[PDB]
Ligand binder design. Structure first.
Ligand SMILES: Cn1cc(-c2cn(C)c3ccc(Oc4ccc(NC(=O)[C@@H]5CCCN5)cc4)cc23)cn1
Ligand SMILES: Cn1cc(-c2cn(C)c3ccc(Oc4ccc(NC(=O)[C@@H]5CCCN5)cc4)cc23)cn1
Ligand SMILES: O=P(O)(O)OC[C@H]1O[C@](O)(CO)[C@@H](O)[C@@H]1O
Ligand SMILES: O=P(O)(O)OC[C@H]1O[C@](O)(CO)[C@@H](O)[C@@H]1O
Lengths: 442, 442
């Protein structure tokens, strides 16, 4: 009666499954199609890629289906905006076939591949196209959530999104000025038939968000569930202003010298030298209003103390909890807990230390850190190896499987700069020796 | 160089403060005035009270300033809607004096009493009144965030908010029908001069949210900071649909019998009897679609197993981490760590166990649980003593100081029902003996 067993890897209590003579599998919430809406150069691909990066990182399987990519596959080389003319009978047919092909892949992804969210990245500017997408969702038992981006021409031009748009393989054999001229003519092709979302009348029953003038205003209609509410919250926190994110670990500590994990030890003499070298590096960057964040552990706070700048301590930035393995060396873990050591090496992301955490737990703890990092401008985060791997996996779009093996050395600053649809990463080693704490996969 | 000391109560690393011969104090982000906007019976007081309860619980000091309460103090007894007539020269003057008096208290609260958010709960239906509030905020260096609730007359009548409105001390000497008739006439007094927020033109530079038809739609203009974004997210998660929240602890466990704290022990024979009694109680409630949540600790999961219902395990519901004091009795804590025992007894909310948590840490961990509980309908939460005190403090509007002493006995269901501007709490003891784990303040 109420007999449970603790799963070996994740440490989850589950009922003892004394399967009968013929074990049976019950193989395998409703998936959602996010429908992007709007004229070209309205940041729909930027939104698609950002939302997908956030949703995968929090653990919701998401994939983007870009109709232009299907088009590039079906039509060898792009010559001009003439392909997008509303009187181009042949190209109109090809473009519709590409949208139907992408939708066939959306169905396979959500109904058969274990996908939870499909982002349908296309203009979807007419009521006819959107009615067709709603029919596809209704017949497959998928929810539909529309994200429209509306922006006037001067704001689009000032935003510099068209420089990202003309970097497409469509403009491989073009100079910047002619690609820009062609893209402008392409936008004009969509203007006459564009029917914006109308929540007052025709679209009153649809779940949607209109992002107006690069986030200056939002219209939200019929939020149905938690993921729609969360997406709205995420869209209100992100921004396109230029800034820099700096990520580093605390300076080398006394536990690092002994090869000991966790704990709350202080900086070693080298760790103190790195903290000084970090202050000099920060001064040389000459940043406007740098925000500095640390964990609540001693080594990060001593590192921030050398900067002579205000800083905020976050408990969410504390290093992964090793539970019963806290303050042990990896050799002491292998000898005292050999089964635990082998299970972690085999499933490092999902493995939970006894009475401790997994990288999967770290992601959940770190989500408010990520949300606040999106809102901020210049930020320096002084943290710890496993925490840093998690944050870096979010910015660099790394999977759960690669996250626990990302290289984050001591005394090295990782400088992140927002470029196109992601981050440029520059590594800056501050020339202070330390031990190596990186352990490659077995 | 980089010399730190760990604070005794909160365990925060701080620089050693070797104060000079003449110790100096630097005594003592910009506060916000939330401006409610709209006709009477639009749920402005419901929103004011809900937001204030959430903001105080997460640790942002918030207070509501209701102009009607200042009016009731200045004018002994309410006779009728004639007091709210736009041609009532005397009452118009008194009403303006009450709004100015409430604003004087907003200034004192935010500039001198350590308040962070003041909710200005009044109609504020004219551009003149709102311009005056904007001048007050601008001259005091306060931010202004407007929350307007717009709803048509049939939707207001169907919502049943006017039954809450007529329960006011204004209608103490009235029967339900005449109070309802008077309140209807009162609303009509505000209609001719009502100038709704206009983000397209006149209010384009204001930070605001329009809540349309009891949350069916939202208009969000110029979100400035994290607390505005968070309020929008909270407003998208709450709802006014009827439902029930049930809160209880796991059945008595083996650590409870030994007087031991924390750990991951299983149910005792009495705890198993309570789990059976809980299944019978749940069956007798005859609820539509009950969601069941547990922690990831054994005792709550064994309790949920007796229900024969699907359940979800949340790591955020795990009991407070006692760090180095895990699995000790309170007598073993007093004898091994006498200084730690005395510090906790003196500051129970802020006290952090070494390598463990405080109730303040629990609130931060539990915020996504609260957000999801707001979204749901019927829910049963099977958790632990300190976690349950935190959740109960949110629903019952209890302060941080009283939260660690709330009575949450074993084998007892706390049934929460939404009524007016809060929760009705009914206690249901399931007639199964157990130890007592409650410890009163010293
Ligand atoms: C990388 N990049 C994207 C753009 C871009 C251009 N245009 C015309 C766009 C339109 C929408 C767009 O996507 C968003 C832009 C902004 C926001 N959110 C915000 O700006 C929030 C609200 C107020 C505070 N911050 C959310 C989405 C991004 C763009 C420009 N550069
Ligand atoms: C307790 N109670 C309040 C009302 C009420 C009446 N009227 C006319 C109101 C208008 C607004 C109001 O406040 C909100 C009502 C709803 C929401 N949010 C929502 O409904 C979200 C969005 C979609 C999913 N759930 C946020 C605030 C509440 C009310 C009725 N009973
Ligand atoms: O997941 P990994 O590779 O064991 O790295 C995390 C470890 O790295 C450290 O930050 C440094 O050794 C430890 O405190 C922590 O347990
Ligand atoms: O904050 P208090 O009053 O010590 O109660 C929390 C304690 O109650 C228990 O849930 C039961 O004794 C312990 O596991 C936990 O440490």
């Amino acid at each position: 009666p109420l007999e449970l067993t603790q799963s070996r890897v994740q440490k989850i209590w589950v009922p003892v499954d004394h399967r009968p003579s013929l074990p049976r599998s019950c193989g395998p919430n409703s998936p959602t199609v996010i429908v992007m809406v709007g004229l070209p150069a309205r940041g729909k691909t930027y939104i698609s890629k950002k939302l997908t990066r956030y949703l995968n990182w929090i653990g919701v399987p998401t994939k983007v289906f870009n109709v232009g990519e299907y088009r590039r596959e079906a039509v060898k080389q792009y010559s001009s905006y003439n392909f997008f003319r509303p009187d181009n009978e042949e190209a109109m047919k090809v473009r519709k076939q590409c949208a139907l092909a992408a939708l066939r892949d959306v169905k396979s992804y959500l109904a058969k591949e274990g996908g939870q969210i499909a982002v349908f990245d296309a203009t979807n500017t007419t009521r006819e196209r959107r009615h067709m997408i709603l029919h596809f969702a209704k017949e497959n038992d998928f929810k539909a959530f529309f994200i429209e981006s509306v922006c006037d021409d001067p704001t689009v031009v000032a935003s510099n999104i068209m420089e990202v748009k003309i970097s497409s393989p469509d403009y491989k054999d073009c100079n910047s000025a002619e690609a820009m001229d062609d893209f402008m003519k392409r936008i004009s092709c969509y203007e006459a038939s564009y029917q914006p979302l109308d929540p007052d009348k025709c679209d009153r029953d649809l779940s949607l968000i209109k992002v107006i003038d690069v986030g200056r205003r939002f219209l939200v209609n019929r939020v149905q569930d938690h993921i729609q509410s969360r997406i709205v919250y995420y869209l209100m926190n992100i921004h396109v202003q230029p800034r820099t994110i700096y990520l580093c670990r605390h300076g080398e500590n006394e536990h690092n010298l002994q090869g000991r994990i966790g704990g709350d030890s202080g900086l070693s003499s080298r760790g103190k030298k790195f903290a000084s070298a970090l202050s000099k590096f920060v001064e040389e960057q000459n940043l406007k209003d740098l925000r500095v964040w640390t964990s609540q552990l001693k080594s990060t706070i001593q590192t921030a103390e050398a900067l002579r700048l205000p800083y905020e301590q976050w408990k969410a930035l504390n290093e992964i909890d090793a539970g019963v393995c806290e303050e042990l060396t990896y050799e002491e873990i292998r000898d005292t807990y050999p089964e635990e050591y082998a299970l972690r090496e085999q499933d490092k992301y999902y493995y939970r230390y006894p009475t401790g955490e997994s990288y999967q737990d770290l992601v959940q703890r770190l989500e408010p850190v990520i949300m606040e990092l999106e809102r901020q401008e210049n930020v320096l985060v002084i943290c710890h190896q496993a925490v840093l791997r998690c944050l870096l996996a979010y910015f660099l779009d790394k999977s759960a499987e690669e996250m626990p093996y990302l290289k984050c050395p001591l005394h090295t600053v990782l400088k992140l700069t927002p470029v196109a649809y992601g981050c440029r990463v520059e590594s800056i080693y501050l020339n202070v020796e330390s031990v190596c704490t990186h352990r490659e996969r077995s």
